[PDB]
């Protein structure tokens, strides 16, 4: 609508080329930061396992 910001996030885990692990939409930057932090923590845990 020329003013609102919509962020579409597609995170594909390293399992398959088409098995999209997560695909979400966001309109609040705060939730964007929260989900980014959660994804970073999940990646760190995956690297720790």
């Amino acid at each position: 609508n020329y003013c609102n910001a919509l962020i579409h996030i597609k995170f594909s885990a390293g399992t398959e080329a088409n098995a999209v692990s997560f695909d979400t939409t966001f309109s609040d930057f705060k939730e964007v930061e929260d989900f980014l932090h959660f994804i970073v923590a999940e990646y760190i845990q995956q690297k720790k396992v």
């Binding site: 309109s27 609040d28 705060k30 939730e31 929260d34």
Partner: protein, 77 residues
């Protein structure tokens, strides 16, 4: 024009004072024409949202309304 503006501001102030008396919106110290509504954005966050009154037609509006926020502002109107 000045009389009309004074009547407009007085009506808006009366409505705002009624809302404050109902204790639904907290008082904004910085702006006397802005109402603060407490809403939790996340589980732990507890943040205020600024609602303002149109000086011309008198419909409540948010500063950066989300689609749900815009829908419920229209419902308020």
């Amino acid at each position: 024009e000045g009389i009309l503006d004074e009547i407009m501001f007085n009506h808006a102030r009366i409505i705002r004072s009624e809302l404050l008396a109902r204790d639904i919106f907290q008082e904004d110290e910085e702006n006397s024409d802005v109402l603060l509504f407490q809403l939790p954005t996340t589980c732990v966050s507890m943040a205020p949202i600024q609602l303002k009154i149109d000086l011309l037609s008198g419909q409540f509006y948010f500063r950066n309304p989300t689609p749900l926020l815009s829908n419920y502002a229209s419902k308020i109107n």
